[PDB]
Structures are given as structure tokens and as C-alpha cells.
Amino acid sequence: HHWGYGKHNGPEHWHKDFPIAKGERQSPVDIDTHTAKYDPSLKPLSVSYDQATSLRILNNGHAFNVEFDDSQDKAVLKGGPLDGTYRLIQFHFHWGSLDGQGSEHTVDKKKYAAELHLVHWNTKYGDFGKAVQQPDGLAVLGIFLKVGSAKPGLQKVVDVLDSIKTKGKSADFTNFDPRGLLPESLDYWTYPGSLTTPPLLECVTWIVLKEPISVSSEQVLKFRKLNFNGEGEPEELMVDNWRPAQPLKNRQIKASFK
Numbered sequence: 001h002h003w004g005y006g007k008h009n010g011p012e013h014w015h016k017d018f019p020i021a022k023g024e025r026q027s028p029v030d031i032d033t034h035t036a037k038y039d040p041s042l043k044p045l046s047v048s049y050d051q052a053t054s055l056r057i058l059n060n061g062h063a064f065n066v067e068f069d070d071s072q073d074k075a076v077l078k079g080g081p082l083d084g085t086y087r088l089i090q091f092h093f094h095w096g097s098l099d100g101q102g103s104e105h106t107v108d109k110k111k112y113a114a115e116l117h118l119v120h121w122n123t124k125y126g127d128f129g130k131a132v133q134q135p136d137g138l139a140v141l142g143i144f145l146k147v148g149s150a151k152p153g154l155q156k157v158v159d160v161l162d163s164i165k166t167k168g169k170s171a172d173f174t175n176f177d178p179r180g181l182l183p184e185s186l187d188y189w190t191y192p193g194s195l196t197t198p199p200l201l202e203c204v205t206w207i208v209l210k211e212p213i214s215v216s217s218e219q220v221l222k223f224r225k226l227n228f229n230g231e232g233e234p235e236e237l238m239v240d241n242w243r244p245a246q247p248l249k250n251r252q253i254k255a256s257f258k
């Protein structure tokens, strides 16, 4: 039937319905820190989330999304490698069944316990559905999670997960501040890539932060209690919802720092 992360419908199968899976600019990738080139002409990132308006949290059967009002310039990303203004639409995570795996990007082949994706679309294209059809349509800010001390700013998300256990459930989720999920440094690597789930469209400028955030064992354990299935269907835990690293091909990863 349809795509997912199991033995019979996982990443190795996606190319049959989505041939772009074997394309020229697929994500995620391994970030080889010694091969990445410092680019002194790259600007500092500008993350402007003070006016962000969260609305809802949704289990979509693949992850959970915290969704934002993107009908005005309320929470925007600019600068760095980007030309123009990109509006925050949603964030979500990918995570593992074990602390030793779960991230999509890797760093010198190292896997982190999870990865946060803050998804933004280029305002010159008018809406998200048009943006994904463009080579410079999206900017995704990727942040690694390691297991250690708790992240206080994540706790409001963890506590609502019981109310969206199964595919298709949603809950009101207002007044959440995504600034509480950011590390101290905004040093980053950047490369042109794709969505990491079907439809795997090649529309993303990836900006991956060098500094991970730490979350507690209890926080990530709660992610692992979510379900891929709908209510009343056989229970399958939502774990290991990550795509592995794809070939770099004809691309260079640039660093904002040395």
C-alpha cells in the first residue's frame, strides 16, 4: 500500500512511487566536517520568531507537526545563504527507537538521538504548495538532539502528546514559543537538497546547526509512545521515522564558521 518506515514500505521502496528518490540533490546527507568549506561571504542567520503564532499540533501518521499561522510575516528566517524572506509554517522531529540513532543528517557518520526540522517557505511564491515546486522554495533549519539534561522549552510539546496518540488526531496548541528550542550558537552548515519524505521534492536550502540541544531520556521516551496507526487499528509505535544519508553527488557543503 502506501509509504512509511517499515520493512515493506520504507526508504528502500520509495523510488517505485517517487523516482526523484534517486535524483541529483536528495536529503539528508552525511556532513563530513573536514571536507566542508568555510565561506566567509555567508551572512549570520536572522531568526525572527518573537511574533510567532502557533495554532495546532497534528499526528499525521509519519511524525507530529506543530503548525503556525503563516498568513502574515510573523515568524521568519532570513540571511545566511538565503535571498529574501522565508515564513515559518510548521516544525516536527524525526527520532529513533534507541538513543544511538534517530537523526536524518549525520556528522562524520555520527547519528544523534533525534532531529528537529523548522520548515519555512519563500514568500516570493505566495504559498507553501507553490514554493515546493521551486528550486529555492523552502528553507529548513535542522537542529540535532542529544540525550542529557532536559530542554525546558520542549516540555509543553511533550505533555500534549497523549492527546494525539494516533494518526489523524489533532489538538489546539496556541502560544507556543519556538525560540525555546534553539541552541546558544547559530553556526551552521548549508547545502541544496530535498524533502526527506515523499514526495522528496528538490526544493530545499538546508541549514543545519552545528550545536545540538540536549533533551532528557524522559522527554524522548514520550515521543516513542506515539503511534503510526489510527485509533482502533493494530498498535505500531512511532519510532525510527528517519531516512538514512543519501549520496552527495555534485554538491559542496559550506560552513559559516571555522
Ligand SMILES: NS(=O)(=O)c1ccccc1
Binding pocket: 117, 119, 140, 194, 195, 196, 197, 198
Ligand atoms: N522532513 S522535511 O524535509 O523537513 C519535510 C518538510 C515538509 C514536508 C515533508 C518533509
Ligand SMILES: [Zn+2]
Binding pocket: 092, 093, 094, 117, 196
Ligand atoms: Zn523532517
